[PDB]
From TrEMBL:
Record protein name field: Beta-phosphoglucomutase
Source species of the chain: Bacteroides thetaiotaomicron (strain ATCC 29148 / DSM 2079 / JCM 5827 / CCUG 10774 / NCTC 10582 / VPI-5482 / E50)
InterPro entries in alphabetical order: HAD-like_sf (IPR036412), HAD-like_SPP (IPR051806), HAD-SF_hydro_IA (IPR006439), HAD_2 (IPR041492), HAD_sf (IPR023214), PGP-like_dom2 (IPR023198)
Presence of keyword Metal-binding: yes
Chain positions recorded as Mg(2+) 2 binding sites: 175
Binding site for Ca(2+) 3: 191
Any GO BP: carbohydrate metabolic process
Residue numbers binding (R)-malate: 8, 110-111, 144
List of residues binding Mg(2+) 1: 8, 10, 44, 168-169
Tagged with keyword Calcium: yes
Superkingdom, natural source: Bacteria
Entry binding sites for Mg(2+) 3: 188, 207
Binding site for Ca(2+) 2: 163
């Protein structure tokens, strides 16, 4: 039944998670808030505004103001962009070529609003993605772990949930894919215990994008 493969971006397509976790950790530290690199990784999937608000609630016992959200989001984006630009996750391009050769539609479903990465998708993965077949921070009211972004991806692609598969590296994205009713494959590309991804609702778990790519033609959907 499979028609489309819905990829997260950060930690699936780009090896950008060390940078995102460093930048969140450092900007929060500047603001006097403790967020470890691993706790930052655990927020992958959220929009930046949702991350900031939840960290304020957890650490300060209050909501972030709109000004705090915009300031901190810009600060983190500027710091992220100050690093040498993120490179591809090994295995992603090989997998995309396989998916496309099988007649399947690649899509991106991300909580990112980071234009530096979004505008590099075409040069990194030529011929794969299209803006009207992507969901980003710009498209959603509620991001991951709410199923909204994955539900929206299904609609953009004219798909039913049973015609798609989700490829996720982070538990909030796994949860969103699963709760959207879509079969969800976790790829453990970061510092987390794989069990965190299984417990978030992943139907399958692979230890890298390359191993997923190697097994791809035996996943019968
Ligand atoms: Cl990382
Ligand atoms: Cl960013």
């Amino acid at each position: 039944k499979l028609k489309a493969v819905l990829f997260n971006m950060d930690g699936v397509l780009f090896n950008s998670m060390p940078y995102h976790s460093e930048a969140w950790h450092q900007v929060m530290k500047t603001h006097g808030l403790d967020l470890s690199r691993e706790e930052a990784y655990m927020h992958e999937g959220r929009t930046g505004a949702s991350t900031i608000n939840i960290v304020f609630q957890r650490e300060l016992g209050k909501e972030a103001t709109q000004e705090e959200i915009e300031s901190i989001y810009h600060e983190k984006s500027i710091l992220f962009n100050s690093y040498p630009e993120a490179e591809r996750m090994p295995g992603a391009w090989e997998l995309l070529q396989k998916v496309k050769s099988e007649g399947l539609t690649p899509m991106v479903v991300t909580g990112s609003g980071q234009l530096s990465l979004l505008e590099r998708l075409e040069h990194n993965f030529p011929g794969m993605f299209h803006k009207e077949l992507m969901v980003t921070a710009f498209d959603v009211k509620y991001g991951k772990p709410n199923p909204e972004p994955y539900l929206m991806a299904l609609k953009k692609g004219g798909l039913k949930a049973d015609e798609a598969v989700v490829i996720e590296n982070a538990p909030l994205g796994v949860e969103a894919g699963h709760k959207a009713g879509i079969f969800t494959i976790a790829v453990n590309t970061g510092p987390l215990d794989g069990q965190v991804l299984l417990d978030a609702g992943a139907d399958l778990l692979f230890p890298s994008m390359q191993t997923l790519c190697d097994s791809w033609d035996t996943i019968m959907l």
